[PDB]
A = this chain, B = another copy of it.
């Protein structure tokens, strides 16, 4: 009957859809429905298994695994980014400590420069006063000589 054929094709089609959802292994029964509604009972080979989009795992297993991958890949990258930010936080503190130390060096350099200028000025006055005193003495001697 025609109803025998429709029922046979439907069962084999339902079977094959089930294997796409729940997977298949090497040796497991697989049906090939020919364009003329012909059912061919075949036992899947290592070829059919290895050369399948999901390699006989089925949509459920693949989606369960992909969900695991997505979740692990987020945990993995979040830890890497938290590690990078930790490194950035330490560099920031060390750069602020360097700038604070540089500001103090600059303060100490200004004090040494000003003490230098003040010393230079004080030596000049003493040199001028000393010159004036030695010149005066020389004059008192040059005058006391000629008599």
Contact = CB atoms under 8 A, between A and B. Distances in A.
B70 A20 contact: no
Interface string A74-86: 1001101100110
Chain copies in complex: 3
Contact of A60 (B9, B10, B59, B140): B59
A64 B140 CA distance: 113
Nearest to A92: B91
B91 A95 contact: yes
A1 to B, nearest CB: 7
Nearest to A4: B3
Interface in A99-122: 99, 101-102, 105-106, 108-109, 112-113, 115-116, 119-120, 122
A63 B63 contact: yes
A142 to B, nearest CB: 10
Contacts of A51: none
Contacts of A116: 112, 115-116, 119
A55 to B, nearest CB: 12
Interface of A: 1, 3-4, 6-11, 13-18, 20-22, 53-54, 59-60, 62-64, 66-67, 69-70, 73-74, 77-78, 80-81, 84-85, 87-88, 91-92, 94-95, 98-99, 101-102, 105-106, 108-109, 112-113, 115-116, 119-120, 122-123, 126-127, 130, 133-134, 137-138, 140-141
